[PDB]
């Protein structure tokens, strides 16, 4: 019994240095904050398979599609047997076909036979009630919820010689009132959209609602998410919407509103922890582990943690970890929109000493978002814990253990036509390039055969001569057309700039060509102060620009050289804009436009102010 309570509420929130101290002067850390002390706790997935099989909104009424818990059947009472583990999941086309043992990790068994009982309605929830330790035994009956009816299955004498579970069923009650029910729990006790009733389970499958019922119907809650749970064996129930928790005990006529969650948060999920005292609630904006009180079994609102994520689709599952000194309660919240879990570690001792340790987060598989996560009970400081997930938009279920110590078919469905006459007609082009490339690896190889020849020194003396007079031909039009009052190509010669075999020479040759035009109507843009845009560093030269690609394309090409040469021989001819006039030509085209606009755009056009 620590001290800092409200009576009504009780907080240990997110790293805000919790609100109590006893001042126990015992030289033994003389403080008992709700915050505990230990080392870290990092978690590591053990990824393994178990089994297999408009969008701007989401349906709250659909709950799960699977379940996994140890079941002890009817014939295990008289005989020695105690506890068999099952997993029952929906399958089929629209989610309509509901269908085991543990070696060291939970895997599907030897005879691995799906017991496909057939329905004609969409599966929307699959859950057991659980068990009791005051009853001493385990329940051997499970109930499911569909759109058209409500069903109860009864698991009778699970077999060990054949690994086959024969299943029995009750009467699927259809709807007398046309309103879609939401949640089942037993501890046909069901919650319809706005009202509930108690259903009676029979003993005879060889061939309903009791005389007491209640309702919580709110005219101003709009959602279709409800929930029901039995609380603390008194035959008290707890009923939920997204706005309040009502406590109802149908033993008497006694109804109390406990949670009222309209103002700043909402009720999101509610797991009843197998501890018959402690039960964990997920609100929006806070995580609540409100237990039961020994005086009146009504609600011991215990140490709750302010969770940070704000969302509309959060769930929770919890696993108890039973140590001989104390009881842990790790709580796993998960969302349907992204791929993350969020955990927190609670501890419990004998004097209702609920505490808190810290939080951590890990990730999931990149394809989909999680939609159903369940912990295997594991039959019951180096904390170990294990569980199964299920991701939305994939029908696979994997198994995970946590210890203390991107392909889309839409891009596939865009290619690959089934047109066999058009198959090689497309495929000719991939064989057409088998010809055109091998010429290019061989023709510049003939330029690899020659090395700085005077015969190609002549070929580059001939190069600039048809660059000089071609410039002298491309200059002499622009002077006479200069009075335009309202740049060029450098691909005019289609005889050369194909078979020139030196990078440092032509870099000098264009610098030899740059120096020639001291006159007007001809300026340039320098390559070496601009060629760095591909390497994203300081590249002050054209000759060292090759030297970067020289070490770069060594491994990934057969003989690796003239391909690297030809692209460097391409880019300077790819920026073939060396045909700027002098400064006069755009400056005289500046002055013409401001004359044409009115005197209102004179003051609007002023660069170079400060």
């Amino acid at each position: 019994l620590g001290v800092g309570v409200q009576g009504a509420s009780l907080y240990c929130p997110q790293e805000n240095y919790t609100t109590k101290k006893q001042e126990k002067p015992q030289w033994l850390r003389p403080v008992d904050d709700t915050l505990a002390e230990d080392a870290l706790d990092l978690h590591i997935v053990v990824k393994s398979l178990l089994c297999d099989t408009d969008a701007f909104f989401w349906d709250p009424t659909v709950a799960n599609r699977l379940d996994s818990q140890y079941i002890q059947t009817a014939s295990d009472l008289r005989n020695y047997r105690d506890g068999t583990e099952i997993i029952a999941y929906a399958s089929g086309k629209t989610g309509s076909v509901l269908n085991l043992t543990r070696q060291n990790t939970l895997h599907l068994n030897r005879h691995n036979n799906v017991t496909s009982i057939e329905l004609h309605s969409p599966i929307k929830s699959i859950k057991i009630p659980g068990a009791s330790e005051s009853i001493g035994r385990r329940s051997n009956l499970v109930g499911i919820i569909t759109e058209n009816s409500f069903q109860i299955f009864r698991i009778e004498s699970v077999h060990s010689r054949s690994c086959d579970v024969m299943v029995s069923s009750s009467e699927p009650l259809y709807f007398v009132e046309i309103d879609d029910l939401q949640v089942v729990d037993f501890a046909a006790i069901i919650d319809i959209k706005g009202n509930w009733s108690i259903g009676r389970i029979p003993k005879n499958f060889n061939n309903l609602i009791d005389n007491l019922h209640g309702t919580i119907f709110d005219p101003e809650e709009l959602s279709s998410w409800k929930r029901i749970e039995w609380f603390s064996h008194f035959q008290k129930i707890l009923v939920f919407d997204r706005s309040k928790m009502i406590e109802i005990d149908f033993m008497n006529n006694w109804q109390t509103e406990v949670v009222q969650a309209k103002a700043w948060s909402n009720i999101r999920d509610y797991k009843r922890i197998d501890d018959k005292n402690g039960i964990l609630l997920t609100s929006r904006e806070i995580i609540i582990v409100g237990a039961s009180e020994s005086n009146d079994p009504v609600r011991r609102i215990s140490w709750k943690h302010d969770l940070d994520p704000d969302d509309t689709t959060l769930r929770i599952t919890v696993q108890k970890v039973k140590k001989p000194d104390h009881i842990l309660l790790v709580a796993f919240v998960y969302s349907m929109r992204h791929k993350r879990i969020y955990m927190h570690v609670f501890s419990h001792r004998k004097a209702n000493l609920f505490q808190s340790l810290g939080c951590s987060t890990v990730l999931e598989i990149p394809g989909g978002t999680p939609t159903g996560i369940e912990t295997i009970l594991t039959l019951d400081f180096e904390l170990v814990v294990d569980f199964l997930v299920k991701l939305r938009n994939s029908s696979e279920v994997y198994y995970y253990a946590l210890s203390n110590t991107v392909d889309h078919p839409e891009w596939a469905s865009l290619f690959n036509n089934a047109d066999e006459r058009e198959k090689e007609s497309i495929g000719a082009l991939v064989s057409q390039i088998k010809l055109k490339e091998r010429e290019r690896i061989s023709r510049v190889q003939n330029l690899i055969e020659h090395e700085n020849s005077h015969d190609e020194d002549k070929y580059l003396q001939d190069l600039g001569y048809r660059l000089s007079i071609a410039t002298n031909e491309l200059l002499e039009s622009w002077q006479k057309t200069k009075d335009e009052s309202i740049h060029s190509k450098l691909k005019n010669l289609l005889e050369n700039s194909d078979s020139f075999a030196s990078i440092p020479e032509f870099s000098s040759l264009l610098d030899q060509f740059f120096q020639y035009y001291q006159d007007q109507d001809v300026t340039f843009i320098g390559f070496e102060k601009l060629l760095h845009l591909f390497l994203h560093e300081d590249v002050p030269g054209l000759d060292i620009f090759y030297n970067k690609l020289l070490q770069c394309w060594v491994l990934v090409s057969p003989q690796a050289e003239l391909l690297t040469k030809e692209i460097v021989k391409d880019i300077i001819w790819s920026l073939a804009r060396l045909e700027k006039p002098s400064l006069f030509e755009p400056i005289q085209n500046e002055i013409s436009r401001s004359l044409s606009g009115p005197y209102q755009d004179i003051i609007s056009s002023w660069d170079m102010d400060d």
């Binding site: 055109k436 490339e437 790819s574």
Partner: protein, 103 residues
């Protein structure tokens, strides 16, 4: 300056869903980029950029240059596309750099 005259002026949200390409074409419809400027994409640089993105064997550089030659009007000189007739977008997606993204 008025608030809606400055909320346009201060850039809040980035250009998205081809907002940048439309504003290129809307500008080129206002003042004509032809017969005074060269609507010429240096596609050799863009493919060399896209070769240098994912470290491929550079034979696909030489392939893609050949591939555009198979399907292109006036083989070089890639078309910067003005629009003034419609306020609709060009569903052919006639942006030349956006065309190379498919090639």
């Amino acid at each position: 300056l008025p608030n809606y005259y400055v909320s346009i002026l201060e850039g809040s949200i980035s250009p998205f869903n081809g907002q940048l390409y439309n504003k290129i074409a809307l500008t080129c419809g206002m003042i004509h980029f032809k017969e005074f400027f060269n609507s010429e994409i240096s596609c050799q640089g863009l493919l060399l950029k896209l070769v240098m993105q994912c470290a491929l064997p550079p034979e696909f550089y030489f392939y893609t240059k050949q591939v555009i030659e198979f399907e292109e009007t006036d083989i070089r000189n890639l078309t910067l596309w003005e629009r003034t007739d419609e306020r609709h977008t060009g569903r052919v997606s006639n942006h030349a750099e956006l065309r190379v993204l498919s090639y």
